[PDB]
Design an enzyme around this catalytic site. Structure first.
Site, PDB file in Angstrom:
ATOM      1  N   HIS A  21       5.184  22.343 -26.830  1.00  0.00           N
ATOM      2  CA  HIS A  21       5.234  22.225 -25.375  1.00  0.00           C
ATOM      3  C   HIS A  21       3.876  22.415 -24.710  1.00  0.00           C
ATOM      4  CE1 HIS A  21       8.212  21.226 -22.545  1.00  0.00           C
ATOM      5  NE2 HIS A  21       8.469  22.412 -22.025  1.00  0.00           N
ATOM      6  N   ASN A  69       8.003  25.323 -15.736  1.00  0.00           N
ATOM      7  CA  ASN A  69       8.949  24.850 -14.737  1.00  0.00           C
ATOM      8  C   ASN A  69       8.489  25.127 -13.311  1.00  0.00           C
ATOM      9  OD1 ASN A  69       9.454  27.632 -14.593  1.00  0.00           O
ATOM     10  ND2 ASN A  69      11.651  27.332 -14.255  1.00  0.00           N
ATOM     11  N   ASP A  94       4.066  16.507 -23.341  1.00  0.00           N
ATOM     12  CA  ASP A  94       4.736  16.248 -24.608  1.00  0.00           C
ATOM     13  C   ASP A  94       5.936  15.333 -24.390  1.00  0.00           C
ATOM     14  OD1 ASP A  94       5.192  18.806 -23.205  1.00  0.00           O
ATOM     15  OD2 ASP A  94       6.938  18.987 -24.535  1.00  0.00           O
ATOM     16  N   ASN A 115      10.804  19.931 -18.162  1.00  0.00           N
ATOM     17  CA  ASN A 115      10.887  20.871 -17.042  1.00  0.00           C
ATOM     18  C   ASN A 115       9.587  20.959 -16.239  1.00  0.00           C
ATOM     19  OD1 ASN A 115       9.996  21.842 -19.494  1.00  0.00           O
ATOM     20  ND2 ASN A 115      10.742  23.952 -19.185  1.00  0.00           N
TER      21      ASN A 115
END
Ligand SMILES: CC(=O)Nc1ccc(-c2csc(N)n2)cc1
Length: 189
Positions: A21, A69, A94, A115
């Site tokens: 991530h 997020n 990603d 997110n």
């Protein structure tokens, strides 16, 4: 030129420094290298920023420290201070739907459940920003996705990802001047 700001996505801390991530961050730490820029913490932009000296106009580099997020909070702040439109921004993230070392390019469109992308679309008020999508592969069931991105790829795909960012670094002149078809044809080989 066009595209005034380039953003890399990740989570903060060393417990996330090696996770999939954080692939966006991995690109930015090398893009900064290509342009001899260095990172300084700007509290007012909620992250680390860098000024990249270019003949046609300075380009801003941003890694948010918001957590993923909340990434949009950093992007919106920077575009606010320097009056930058959504279509003048590139975000590097990603991408599960393509495998390690593949790299794909588009403007706007769907986010595939990311997110970070979600919050950036929420805070800029549109989906219409440019995305550099870096393949990290995917598990078997997507009930497994959250655990997948929060873990280390390691070994083979880390090398393939480094090749991915190396190949992405050669397309940036056409991206910044704005030649979508040209860079898109170079990247999809
Ligand atoms: C609680 C939490 O960690 N949520 C979350 C949501 C979406 C994603 C995601 C979608 S596509 C991609 N590469 N990552 C990861 C994590």
């Amino acid at each position: 030129n066009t595209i005034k700001m380039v953003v890399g996505l990740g989570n903060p801390g060393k417990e996330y420094e090696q996770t999939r991530h954080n692939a966006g961050f991995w690109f930015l730490d090398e893009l900064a290298w290509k342009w001899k820029a260095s990172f300084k913490e700007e509290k007012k932009f909620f992250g680390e920023v860098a000024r990249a000296a270019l003949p046609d106009g300075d380009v801003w580099l941003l890694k948010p420290a918001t957590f993923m997020n909340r990434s949009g909070q950093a992007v919106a702040a920077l575009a606010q201070f320097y009056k930058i439109k959504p279509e003048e921004i590139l975000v590097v993230h990603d991408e599960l739907d393509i495998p390690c070392g593949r790299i794909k390019f588009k403007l706007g469109g769907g986010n595939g459940g990311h997110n970070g992308l979600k919050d950036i679309q929420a805070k800029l008020g549109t989906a219409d920003y440019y995305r550099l999508r870096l393949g990290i592969g995917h598990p078997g069931d997507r009930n497994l996705v959250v655990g997948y991105v929060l873990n280390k790829p390691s070994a083979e795909h880390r090398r393939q990802i480094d090749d991915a960012v190396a190949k992405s670094l050669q397309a940036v002149p056409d991206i910044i001047s704005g030649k979508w078809e040209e860079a898109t044809r170079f990247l999809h080989s």
